[PDB]
Design a protein around this ligand. Structure first.
Ligand code: UQY
Length: 435
């Protein structure tokens, strides 16, 4: 594995021990061989779990998720996928790591795809080694991989709205359920229905994950209602998964707007990871996987792969050379390598609109490539009427930085800025000049 020019896919089944057994063996070998190593965790929760598995090994934790006094002699760095890609885009020197280890390497957020493209390009150049750890590599067609213990797989109609009748099996259960929903708003309605039926419900999504995930350890619960973020190494002491088998697909329409299409079927990889939350205890056979639809390759034409190209076009590799997407995920949506490469000041604007602005990649790119500076928010108000953002069926309004009350009507409409109440609140603060 550890030889220059090798990319290894470590594709042991979910719960096989990639994170807690194999990763420390890899790191000890890497240290013996004096390999400057990076370990990429998908989330702060996984970063903290890795610290427990690696405790006693000299690892530099480049995350506030871990409170450790570093020796300053570590040659192994650990950070999140997003942090790696962020530091590559910033005017900060990222070491040319000899060994690049990506845990939960199926993650399809743009920064994870971009990190795989950068790393796989360095390996192809003959510069580095890489290990991608995941039960479900890109293009897997198996939604039912092996598990530590037998799983009961059942195809069943799964509610996606509040219900009064016809789904007794949902609430008759006396254990712990992880339920994958396609969106925060859909989980909100299911969670309210379960809470009314007397259940204890925890909701997880990207923006809430570190904080809310701790509740799954610190309090008794009957249901976790989660988006797809729990596919990325989230472990639960559960005995059932309920899987809508649905997700939202961001889609760029006519190069000019992003919609959240669907809900529509998950990929096989997503279905396998959702299912893979259970069957993990070799002493507890018969965990249940209830699934409410089929799989499809909904990663084709999905905006994240075009967003990953926007990121990689703006990462220095060598002269004007541009890192390719990792080959198995490289031909999922039309892109021309280099088409999104920005001149120095526009690139800085692009980076800040993502880092400080918290805007989606695609929307950051539209603003930066238009020659708009980071603090110029006039574009948030000068779009067509059909780009009016709505709040409870009325046009959303903010006070501009000038003190003027204006309707929020962005020049470029990206549905992710108002996917839920928290997103809309954040975008209103942005439009107002508050960050
Ligand atoms: C730059 N990548 C390609 C794409 N996704 O359009 C070019 C055709 C093959 C893959």
């Amino acid at each position: 594995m550890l030889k220059k020019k090798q990319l290894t896919v470590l594709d042991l089944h979910p719960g096989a021990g990639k994170t807690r057994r194999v990763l420390p063996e890899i790191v000890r070998e890497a240290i013996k061989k004096r390999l400057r190593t990076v370990i990429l965790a998908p989330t702060r929760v996984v970063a903290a779990e890795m610290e427990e598995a690696l405790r006693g090994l000299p690892v530099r934790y480049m995350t506030t998720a871990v409170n450790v006094t570093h020796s300053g002699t570590e040659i192994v760095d650990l950070m999140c996928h997003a942090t790696f890609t962020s530091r590559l885009l910033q005017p900060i020197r990222v070491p040319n790591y000899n060994l690049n280890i990506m845990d939960e390497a199926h993650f399809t957020d743009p920064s994870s795809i971009a990190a795989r493209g950068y790393i796989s390009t360095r390996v192809e150049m003959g510069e580095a080694a890489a290990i991608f750890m995941t039960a479900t590599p890109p293009g897997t067609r198996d939604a039912f991989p092996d598990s530590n213990s037998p799983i009961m797989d059942t195809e069943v109609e799964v509610p996606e709205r509040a219900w009064s009748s016809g789904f007794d099996w949902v609430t008759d259960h006396s254990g712990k359920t992880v339920w994958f929903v396609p969106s925060v708003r859909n989980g909100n309605e299911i969670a309210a229905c379960l809470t009314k039926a007397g259940k204890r419900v925890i909701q997880l999504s990207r923006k809430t994950f570190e904080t809310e995930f701790q509740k799954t350890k610190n309090q008794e619960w009957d249901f976790v209602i989660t988006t797809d973020i729990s596919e990325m190494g989230a472990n639960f002491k559960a005995d059932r998964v309920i899987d809508s088998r649905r997700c939202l697909k961001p889609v760029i329409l006519d190069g000019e707007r992003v919609i959240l299409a669907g809900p529509m079927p998950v990929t096989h990889a997503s279905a396998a990871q959702r299912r893979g939350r259970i069957g993990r205890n070799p002493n507890k056979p018969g965990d249940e996987y209830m699934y409410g639809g089929g799989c499809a390759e909904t990663d084709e034409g999905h905006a994240h792969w075009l967003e990953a190209r926007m990121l990689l076009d703006n990462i220095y590799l060598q002269d004007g050379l541009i890192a390719s997407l990792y080959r198995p995920e490289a031909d999922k949506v039309a892109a021309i390598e280099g088409e999104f490469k920005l001149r120095t000041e526009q690139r800085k604007t692009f980076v800040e609109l993502m880092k400080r602005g918290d805007l989606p990649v695609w929307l950051a790119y539209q603003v930066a490539s238009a020659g708009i500076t980071y603090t110029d928010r006039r574009w948030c108000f000068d779009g067509t009427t059909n780009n009016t953002i709505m709040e409870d069926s009325v046009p959303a309004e903010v006070w501009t930085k000038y003190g003027e009350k204006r309707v929020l009507k962005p020049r470029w409409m990206d549905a992710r800025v108002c996917s839920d109440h928290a997103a809309l609140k954040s975008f209103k603060e942005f439009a107002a000049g508050k960050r």
